[PDB]
Design an enzyme around this catalytic site. Structure first.
Site, PDB file in Angstrom:
ATOM      1  N   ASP C  31      12.891  15.805  -8.659  1.00  0.00           N
ATOM      2  CA  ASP C  31      11.645  15.412  -9.312  1.00  0.00           C
ATOM      3  C   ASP C  31      10.977  14.326  -8.474  1.00  0.00           C
ATOM      4  O   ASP C  31      11.254  13.135  -8.656  1.00  0.00           O
ATOM      5  CB  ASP C  31      11.914  14.925 -10.745  1.00  0.00           C
ATOM      6  CG  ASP C  31      10.638  14.668 -11.546  1.00  0.00           C
ATOM      7  OD1 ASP C  31       9.551  14.556 -10.942  1.00  0.00           O
ATOM      8  OD2 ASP C  31      10.729  14.550 -12.790  1.00  0.00           O
ATOM      9  N   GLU C 123      17.012   4.654 -15.910  1.00  0.00           N
ATOM     10  CA  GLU C 123      16.112   5.717 -16.349  1.00  0.00           C
ATOM     11  C   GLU C 123      16.609   6.168 -17.718  1.00  0.00           C
ATOM     12  O   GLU C 123      17.355   7.154 -17.832  1.00  0.00           O
ATOM     13  CB  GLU C 123      16.062   6.868 -15.347  1.00  0.00           C
ATOM     14  CG  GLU C 123      15.355   8.108 -15.862  1.00  0.00           C
ATOM     15  CD  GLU C 123      15.273   9.196 -14.823  1.00  0.00           C
ATOM     16  OE1 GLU C 123      14.332   9.146 -14.010  1.00  0.00           O
ATOM     17  OE2 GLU C 123      16.149  10.090 -14.812  1.00  0.00           O
ATOM     18  N   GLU C 132      18.126  11.295 -26.451  1.00  0.00           N
ATOM     19  CA  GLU C 132      19.368  10.840 -25.824  1.00  0.00           C
ATOM     20  C   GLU C 132      19.816   9.497 -26.386  1.00  0.00           C
ATOM     21  O   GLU C 132      20.974   9.103 -26.205  1.00  0.00           O
ATOM     22  CB  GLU C 132      19.242  10.765 -24.302  1.00  0.00           C
ATOM     23  CG  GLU C 132      19.297  12.122 -23.632  1.00  0.00           C
ATOM     24  CD  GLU C 132      18.942  12.065 -22.162  1.00  0.00           C
ATOM     25  OE1 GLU C 132      19.755  11.532 -21.375  1.00  0.00           O
ATOM     26  OE2 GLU C 132      17.860  12.572 -21.792  1.00  0.00           O
ATOM     27  N   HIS C 280      10.042  16.479 -14.765  1.00  0.00           N
ATOM     28  CA  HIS C 280      11.056  17.205 -15.522  1.00  0.00           C
ATOM     29  C   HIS C 280      11.084  16.811 -16.994  1.00  0.00           C
ATOM     30  O   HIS C 280      11.824  17.426 -17.768  1.00  0.00           O
ATOM     31  CB  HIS C 280      12.436  17.010 -14.882  1.00  0.00           C
ATOM     32  CG  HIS C 280      13.044  15.666 -15.136  1.00  0.00           C
ATOM     33  ND1 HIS C 280      12.754  14.560 -14.367  1.00  0.00           N
ATOM     34  CD2 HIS C 280      13.943  15.256 -16.062  1.00  0.00           C
ATOM     35  CE1 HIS C 280      13.437  13.523 -14.818  1.00  0.00           C
ATOM     36  NE2 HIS C 280      14.167  13.919 -15.845  1.00  0.00           N
TER      37      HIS C 280
HETATM   38  C1  LIG Z   1      18.583  10.065 -18.726  1.00  0.00           C
HETATM   39  C2  LIG Z   1      19.714   9.561 -17.878  1.00  0.00           C
HETATM   40  C3  LIG Z   1      20.980   9.523 -18.245  1.00  0.00           C
HETATM   41  C4  LIG Z   1      22.015   8.995 -17.308  1.00  0.00           C
HETATM   42  O1  LIG Z   1      22.620   7.805 -17.854  1.00  0.00           O
HETATM   43  C5  LIG Z   1      23.982   8.052 -18.160  1.00  0.00           C
HETATM   44  N1  LIG Z   1      24.298   7.404 -19.435  1.00  0.00           N
HETATM   45  C6  LIG Z   1      23.870   7.773 -20.674  1.00  0.00           C
HETATM   46  N2  LIG Z   1      24.322   7.010 -21.649  1.00  0.00           N
HETATM   47  C7  LIG Z   1      25.103   6.075 -20.983  1.00  0.00           C
HETATM   48  C8  LIG Z   1      25.868   4.983 -21.444  1.00  0.00           C
HETATM   49  N3  LIG Z   1      25.972   4.635 -22.728  1.00  0.00           N
HETATM   50  N4  LIG Z   1      26.531   4.250 -20.520  1.00  0.00           N
HETATM   51  C9  LIG Z   1      26.430   4.593 -19.233  1.00  0.00           C
HETATM   52  N5  LIG Z   1      25.743   5.598 -18.685  1.00  0.00           N
HETATM   53  C10 LIG Z   1      25.098   6.304 -19.616  1.00  0.00           C
HETATM   54  C11 LIG Z   1      24.146   9.567 -18.174  1.00  0.00           C
HETATM   55  O2  LIG Z   1      25.490   9.941 -17.897  1.00  0.00           O
HETATM   56  C12 LIG Z   1      23.180   9.955 -17.056  1.00  0.00           C
HETATM   57  O3  LIG Z   1      23.761   9.757 -15.773  1.00  0.00           O
END
Ligand SMILES: *C/C=C/[C@H]1O[C@@H](n2cnc3c(N)ncnc32)[C@H](O)[C@@H]1O
Ligand SMILES: *C/C=C/[C@H]1O[C@@H](n2cnc3c(N)ncnc32)[C@H](O)[C@@H]1O
Ligand SMILES: *C/C=C/[C@H]1O[C@@H](n2cnc3c(N)ncnc32)[C@H](O)[C@@H]1O
Ligand SMILES: *C/C=C/[C@H]1O[C@@H](n2cnc3c(N)ncnc32)[C@H](O)[C@@H]1O
Lengths: 360, 10, 343, 343, 360, 10, 10, 10
Positions: C31, C123, C132, C280
Site C-alpha cells: 500500500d 498503525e 480491531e 487497503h
Molecule cells: C492494524 C495493524 C495491526 C498490527 O498490530 C499488531 N497488534 C495488534 N494488536 C496488538 C497488541 N495488543 N499488541 C501488539 N501488537 C498488536 C498486529 O499483530 C499487526 O501486526
C-alpha cells in the site's frame, strides 16, 4: 466429549460462527449440483426413507431433513451445532413439519439422540473431502445407526492426479519476490524472501483447471462410511503410483472427490471432478516446492499423508519421485489455509496442446 | 480454516 | 491483563494468526500511500525521532521502526504479538540495526518495556478506523510515554456522510430475497426472509465509491490520541445533523477516516477519503434496511453509536431521521463481519 | 560470409544490439504461449532429443537449449551472435549443465561447429514470420544437419486474409492529413500530402484484431524448413484468390502465422492466429492506400510479393484486384518499419 | 570530415534514417510549445532576420527556414543531412521561395556553404539537451557565422535536481526479479538477476513527474553557444551542491533544459521544465543504484560527468554523497538507451504531501 | 474479524 | 528494424 | 539512440 477432545475451542468458535450465517447456508443451497443431487439421491431412493427414522447430522437449514420428509420419513432428528439450528426450527414450524422433523441444537457427539435411526444423511464433505474433519462427526453418529442401517452418502472417493501448470508455480515466486529488493523504502527485505516462498507453498490452491493439465490417470482412495471408524481419519496414508501419460514438469498433485448414495433403488453420484460442472468445493491442487521432470512412460510414485490437527483440518505431507530418475520432491501444506485462486475465467488449456493447426 | 465452504457464483 | 479481558481468546487467536502471515504484511507494505505517507511523516519530522526513544506498537514486519531508525532514533522498542515478530528480528539483523531496534514479542498490554519513550508510532487503524480495537492498545501504550511525549499518528478524524446508491441497496436486498422463495426444491423458505434481510444489512460494505453519491457535507468526529484514554473507546457516540444538498433516497452512511502526524516540523496527513488515492482501508458504507427520502435542504439528524465487543470490534447502531418528515431508520451492524465488495 | 553479404553492417549492429538486452529476453521468455509451446513440443517429442546432438540457432538466453537438455540431449551447441551469449554461459554454469550445453558465440553463418547434429531448434520467426531474415540463418544451419536430421520448428504456415477496419484506415489517413494543411504556422505543407500518405501506409500495422473483421477464408503459404534452401526466401511470391464472404470495404490484408514441431511422437503447433491467445508476435495488417469494395461472393485475386533487403527485412508488394469490377490496388510496404498500434 | 571522425557509421545510418520520416518531422512540428516558441522567437526579433543571411542547421522540413523568410531574411541556407532535405526542397518550390531558401542536402560539417551568414538557427536539442550530439554540429556551423553574428538559440541551461520516487526505484527490482526464480520452466534464472538490475539502472527514465518529488532547488549548468567550442561538449563536468529542502530518500537526479533566443528586440525562452507545458523532450531522470538518505538541511554534493561516445550520445557518470553522513552513491547510464516511461497519466504527487486534511 | 486488513491490488 | 520483437504485457 | 526524439501526444 469426543469433539471437545480433538478440537481447540478457538477453532470450533470461528467454525460454527461461520455456519451460523444464512448467507453461508444460501451459498450452499444455491449450489445446484450439490442440492439437486442430494434431493435426487433421497427422493429417488424413497424406500430407504419411507416410514424410516432419519438422523440428519449437521443439518444447517435442515434442507436435507425436508428431502427426507418429502421421501416419507416417519421421524427425522436434525442435529445442528451452529446457531443455524434455531433458523431450521423456524423452517420446520412454518412448513408444518413439527411432527416429523425434530431439530436438536448441539454437536452430534454431545446431543442425546433418543433413539436409533435407520439411515443417516449428512453433507460432511469439506474441500479435498477431508477438511473440517466433519467426516469423523458423520462416522461418530453411527452410534445411533441401527445394525443394517444405511449412510447417505455411503462412500467417498478422493482422486489424486499429477498436474503441470508453470503459471501457477511461477506465481508463487512472483509474489514472494516482493521481499527480494535491497531498498524497499530504504529497507532490505531480501532476508525474508525464503520465508515468503515457504508460506505460499504451504497453501493448497482452491480453484479449477483444464483437464489437459493432468499428466496421468487419477488414483482413487476410497473411504467406506459404513465400515470406517473415527480413528481411521486421524491418519490418512494415500500411496500413489502414477504412470505418466505426458512429458513435462510435474508441479504438484490435483485433488477432487466423489460421493455415492447407494440406495436400495439406485446409486446416485455427486462428483466434484474437473470433468463435471463446477461445485462450491471446486478442486484443490497441492504444489511441489521443486517440480519433477517426467516423460510419458515414467512412473511418478510417492505418498500423500494427511495428519489431522486440532484446527479441524489436516497437515498435508506429499512426497513424490520419478522412479526412472530418482529425482524426488517433498512439500508440506496446511489444508486449513488454502489460497482461493478462482477468478471466473474459464481455465486455459496447457500450452502445446494444439496437435492440428488452429488456423485450419 | 477461515472459510470452510467457498463461495460459488450464481 | 488489559487485553485478555476485553478480548475473548477465540478472537485473539484468529486475530494474531492473521497477522502472522507474510502475505498479509506484503499487502500492507505494498500500500504505497500508507507506507509512503508514514515514511514522509517520520522523516520530515526527523527531530521528533533524532536521538529519541521510540515505541512501535504492533510493528508487524517492523517497517515503521526502520523509518524511525532512518530518522535518527537512538533506541526503538518494536512490539508485536503475532509470530511476525520473528520475521521482524530477521530484518533488524540483516539491515544491521541490532544496536537500535529491539523487537519485543508479545501484546503491548503484557510486555515489559525497559524505559519510558519519547514518541509512540503505530498503525492502529482498522477499516472505519475503530475495527480491531487496536486504538485501545495504542492508547494503552501511553503508559510508557514521557510527559512531553508525542504520538504518531496524533489524531484520527472519522468522517461520515449520507449517500445514495440504489445499485448497492438492490444488490444486498436481492441477495436476502433468496429466502423469499415459497418453494425452494419444494421447501418454503419465506419464514426466514426477515432474518436474512437483517443479516445481510448487518454487514458494513467495504469498497470504494465515487463522491458524487454523497448527498451532504461530511460530519467529523475526532479522536485525539494524546488526550484520550483506553476507556474512552469502549463507547463512541457520534451525533450527526446533515443538511441535505440533494434530493433522493438516502441509502445509508458512508465512512472514511483521516489521521494526522502532528510533528515538530510539519503535520502530515494520511487520508482514506473517497477523493484520495485508494488504500487497503477503502471506505465503509452502512446500509439502511429501508432507505429514507430527503429533499435538498432537509436536515437528517441521528446518532451513530459504537459499542466495543469482545471480538475486537464494535456493534454499530445507527438511527437516522429526516426531521422534516419524521422518517426514522434504526440499524444494527456488526463491524467484525463486513462485506468486501471491491472487485 | 553468407550473413555479412545479405546484411549491411548498420542493420546488423542495431539488430544484435537489440538482442543483447536482458529486458528483451525477459519479454520473449515471459510470452507464456511461446515459451510453453516450445517446451511442450520438445519434451513431448523427447526422443527426437534423447542422447542426440542438438544445434540451437540464436539461443538468446539459452531457454531452448535447457529444454533440449531436459529432453535428454547428449550435447547441445547453443549459437548466439549478440552479447546475450555471455548471459547464456552464466545460466549453463549455474544450472550445472556445462557438460551438455556448449555456448558458441557468433553468427551461425560464421561459427565452426565441431560435429554434425541430429536436430536443429530455433525461434527464427519475426512478426509476419519473415521479418529479421532469420529463417535464412535457420536454413543456413542445415549444413550441420545429419541426413535424417529434424528441424524444430519443421514448417511455417503464413496465413493472409482480407479485412475491413474503417477505424484503422481513418486513423492512418488522418495522420497523413497533417500534411494537407495549406497554412501550418503560415507554411503551406500541402505539396507533401502525397509523400506523407505513401509513408504512413508503407508501414505494416502490428496489433491484434477480432476475427469478425476478416471478410474471407485465409490463404495459406507454407515454408517447409526441411526442404527449403536459404535462397528460396530471397523472393517469396504468394498468390491469393479470396472468395469474399461479406460485402464491404476491403481495407487490406491481415497476416498471421503458425509453425509446427513435427516430431517422432506428436506434432505440436504454435499459432499466432487472431483466435488464439495473444503472443508477442501479435498479427500484421497491411493497409491499402485506397480500399477496395467487394460484394459477398466476389473474388479478390492478386499477389503478395516479399523481396529480401539488406536491412534484414522485406520489401512487401501487394496488388489486390476485385475481379468482378477490375478495382485494383498496388501497395508497397516496408516490413522493417512497422507501426506498433497495440495499447 | 569532423562528423565522420566522431560518429560510427552504424550510428549515423540509423540516426538519419529516423529523421527521414515525415512522421518524425510531424511529431516535432505538432509540438506546439517547440514550434510556437521558435516562430515567436524569430518573427518577434525581425530585425535580427530582416534582409539578413541565415543558416538553418538541421532544417528538417525547413519550417525554421520559413519563419526566417517570414521575418524578411534575404537568403537562407537550409542544411539537412537526412533524406528529409528533398521534402523541404519540395516545400520551398511549392511555397514559391526558391529565391530566398536554398536547401543544401548534407551534413553541416561537410557541405560547402558558399558564404557567411549573419545568424544561425537550429533545433539541436536532444533530450537532456546533449543527446544526439547535435549541439556540436550547431557549434561547428560557427565557421560560417560572420563576426558579431547571432545564434538562435543563443544559450542553453540544463537543470539538475535530486528527486524522491520510491515507486520508480522499486520498479527496477520488480522487473529484474523476473530472473530470481529457481524453476522458470525448469531453469534457474537467478544467476542473471544482478545483471538485469544493472541493465535497468543504466537506463535514463524519459517521462514527466510532479514538481513536489524534487527535494532541493535546481542547479543550472549553462552552455553559451556564442562562446562554446565543439571540444567543450566532449567532456561535460557538472558539479552540484544541492541543499536539501525535504527529508527523504534521494533516488536520483532529474534533468530538464531551457534555451533562450536572445534577440536584438526581445529574449524568447523555450523551457522544458516540469513547471511548464509538456514538450516532446519531456524530462529525464537518472536513478541511483543505492538511494541516499538526506534530511532537510543536509547537503547533497557530487558530480555529473558526461562523456561523449561514438554513438552520438553520452555516457553518464553520477556520483553523489550526503556530506553530513558521507553516505555516497554512484551510477553509470547510457543516454542513448533511455526508458520511455510516459503513460499519459497526470503525475501523482509524492505521498505525505498533504499538510491539511484532504477531507476538509 | 476474519480478515481485518483487506487485500489491495497492486 | 528498430524493435524486431514487440513488448508483450504480462 | 533508437528514437532520438520522443513521441508527444496530440
Ligand atoms: C492494524 C495493524 C495491526 C498490527 O498490530 C499488531 N497488534 C495488534 N494488536 C496488538 C497488541 N495488543 N499488541 C501488539 N501488537 C498488536 C498486529 O499483530 C499487526 O501486526
Ligand atoms: C459442511 C457442513 C457443515 C454443517 O454441519 C454442521 N456441523 C459440523 N460439525 C458438526 C458437529 N460436530 N455436530 C453438529 N453439526 C456439525 C455445521 O455447523 C454446518 O451446518
Ligand atoms: C527472433 C530471435 C532472434 C535470436 O536469434 C539471434 N540471432 C539472429 N540472427 C542470428 C545469427 N545469424 N546467428 C546467430 N544468432 C542469431 C538473435 O541475437 C536473437 O537472440
Ligand atoms: C533534433 C533535430 C535534428 C535534425 O537535424 C538534422 N541533423 C542532425 N545532425 C546534422 C548534421 N550534422 N548536419 C545536418 N543536419 C543534421 C537531423 O537529420 C534532423 O533533421
Amino acid at each position: 466429549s469426543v469433539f471437545s477432545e480433538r478440537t481447540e475451542e478457538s477453532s470450533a468458535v470461528q467454525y460454527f460462527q461461520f455456519y451460523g450465517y444464512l448467507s453461508q447456508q444460501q451459498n450452499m443451497m444455491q449450489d445446484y449440483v450439490r442440492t439437486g443431487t442430494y434431493q435426487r439421491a433421497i427422493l429417488q431412493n424413497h424406500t430407504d426413507f419411507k416410514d424410516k427414522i432419519v438422523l440428519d447430522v449437521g443439518c444447517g437449514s435442515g434442507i436435507l431433513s425436508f428431502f427426507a420428509a418429502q421421501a416419507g420419513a416417519r421421524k427425522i432428528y436434525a442435529v445442528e451445532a451452529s446457531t443455524m439450528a434455531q433458523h431450521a426450527e423456524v423452517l420446520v414450524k412454518s412448513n408444518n413439519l413439527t411432527d416429523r422433523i425434530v431439530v436438536i441444537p448441539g454437536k452430534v457427539e454431545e446431543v442425546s439422540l433418543p433413539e436409533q435411526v435407520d439411515i443417516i444423511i449428512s453433507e460432511p464433505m469439506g474441500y479435498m473431502l477431508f477438511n473440517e474433519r466433519m467426516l469423523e462427526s458423520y462416522l461418530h453418529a453411527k452410534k445411533y445407526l441401527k445394525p443394517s442401517g444405511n449412510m447417505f452418502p455411503t462412500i467417498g472417493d478422493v482422486h489424486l492426479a499429477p498436474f503441470t501448470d508453470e503459471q501457477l508455480y511461477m506465481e508463487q515466486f512472483t509474489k514472494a519476490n516482493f521481499w527480494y529488493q535491497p531498498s524497499f523504502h530504504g529497507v532490505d527485505l531480501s532476508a525474508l524472501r525464503g520465508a515468503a516462498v515457504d508460506e505460499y507453498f504451504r497453501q493448497p490452491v482452491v480453484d479449477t483447471f483444464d483437464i489437459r493439465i493432468l499428466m496421468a490417470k487419477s488414483v482413487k482412495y476410497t473411504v467406506n462410511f459404513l465400515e470406517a471408524k473415527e480413528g481411521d481419519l486421524h491418519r490418512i496414508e494415500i500411496p500413489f503410483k502414477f504412470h505418466m501419460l505426458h512429458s513435462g514438469l510435474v508441479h504438484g498433485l490435483a485433488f477432487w472427490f466423489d460421493v455415492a448414495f447407494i440406495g436400495s433403488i439406485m446409486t446416485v453420484w455427486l462428483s466434484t471432478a474437473p470433468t463435471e460442472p463446477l461445485t462450491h468445493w471446486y478442486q484443490v491442487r497441492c504444489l511441489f516446492q521443486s517440480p519433477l521432470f517426467a516423460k510419458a512412460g515414467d512412473t511418478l510414485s510417492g505418498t500423500c499423508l494427511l495428519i489431522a490437527n486440532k484446527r479441524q483440518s489436516y497437515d498435508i505431507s506429499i512426497v513424490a519421485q520419478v522412479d526412472q530418475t530418482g529425482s524426488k520432491s517433498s512439500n508440506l501444506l496446511d489444508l486449513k489455509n488454502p489460497f482461493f485462486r478462482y477468478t471466473g475465467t474459464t481455465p486455459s488449456p496447457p500450452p502445446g496442446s494444439h496437435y492440428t493447426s488452429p488456423s485450419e | 480454516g477461515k472459510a470452510p465452504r467457498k463461495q460459488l457464483a450464481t
